[PDB]
Amino acid sequence: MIKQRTLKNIIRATGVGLHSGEKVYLTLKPAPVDTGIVFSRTDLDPVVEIPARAENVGETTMSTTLVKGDVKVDTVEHLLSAMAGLGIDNAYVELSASEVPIMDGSAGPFVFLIQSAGLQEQEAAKKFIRIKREVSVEEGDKRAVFVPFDGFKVSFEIDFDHPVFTQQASVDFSSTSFVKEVSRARTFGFMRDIEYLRSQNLALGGSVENAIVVDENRVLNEDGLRYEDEFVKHKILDAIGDLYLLGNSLIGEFRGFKSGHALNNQLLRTLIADKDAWEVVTFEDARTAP
Ligand SMILES: COC[C@@H]1C[C@H]1C#CC#Cc1ccc(C(=O)NC[C@H]2C[C@@H](NC(=O)[C@@H]3C[C@H](F)CN3)CN2C(=O)C2CC2)cc1
Ligand SMILES: [Zn+2]
Secondary structure: OOEEEEEOOOEEEEEEOOOOOOEEEEEEEOOOOOOOEEEEEOOOOOOEEEEOOHHHEOOOOOOOOEEEOOEEEEOOHHHHHHHHHOOOOOEEEEEOOOEOOOOOOOOHHHHHHHHHOOEEEEEEEOOEEEEOOOEEEEEOOEEEEEEOOOOEEEEEEOOOOOOOOOOEEEEEOOOOOHHHHOOOOOOEEEHHHHHHHHHOOOOOOOOOOOOEEEOOOOEOOOOOOOOOOHHHHHHHHHHHHHHHHHOOEEEEEEEEEOOOHHHHHHHHHHHHHOHHHEEEEOOOOOOOOO
């Protein structure tokens, strides 16, 4: 049967919040069967834990933020994307501040840390959400869609009227490596937006160390891009993080058109609300499973 996984060993890491600019200490701990992913603000007394679930997403439009009361955790999408990538069902994520460390702007450091400390299978069936019906959301010229698909796949398209722009990509994660083809894909910002956001006391941790910085014409980062299609691969990475807020791995296919975390969140909520469109499934034989 396909079994729930947690971590074998705890993992510690240090970084800076993209927005807060704060030094943050991160601890990933193993967790019992059916825990899910739980974020923990250890700096607070008493400690505040927010389950990494769609119901707990705050109305923050810079990044994916979890809330409970007036306590927040900012920029969860890259870490969740890394746990999604490696099929982690159960883990505590301890933080010493309000924001996940940005590290290098991608999921690579997080995927390295997780596999460094190993995975532990647990004596419980892994539960999957299987897409049964197409579910679509739009707003203006943006669109986000679930389609039934025997497997897991993400297609994305962006359309920036900028000289620096493939703006399309499609990855079947049952045939292609999350780790090799998507995990190293970094976040990106335009020089004028960064200048603005700095003026509003935001992007305080941003640098070429943790982002592709783009002016009107070109990539400013001396060493360039990691993929010809790094920008749209980072969109895929982000979506995979957002999807993992379902609290169960997906059997189906996602399509983004100029989508972001706000419309991504609308699609998760519309899916959860339409019980005709999905079922939870387990697999007694890993050999016959998609
Ligand atoms: C020493 O270096 C000097 C350079 C000048 C210093 C700097 C810096 C910085 C920065 C920075 C980078 C990125 C950003 C930033 O918020 N980028 C958003 C980008 C990338 C992608 N969203 C994501 O990645 C999401 C959100 C967060 F980004 C992490 N998950 C979609 N997206 C867009 O559509 C923007 C609107 C055009 C915001 C800020
Ligand atoms: Zn991102």
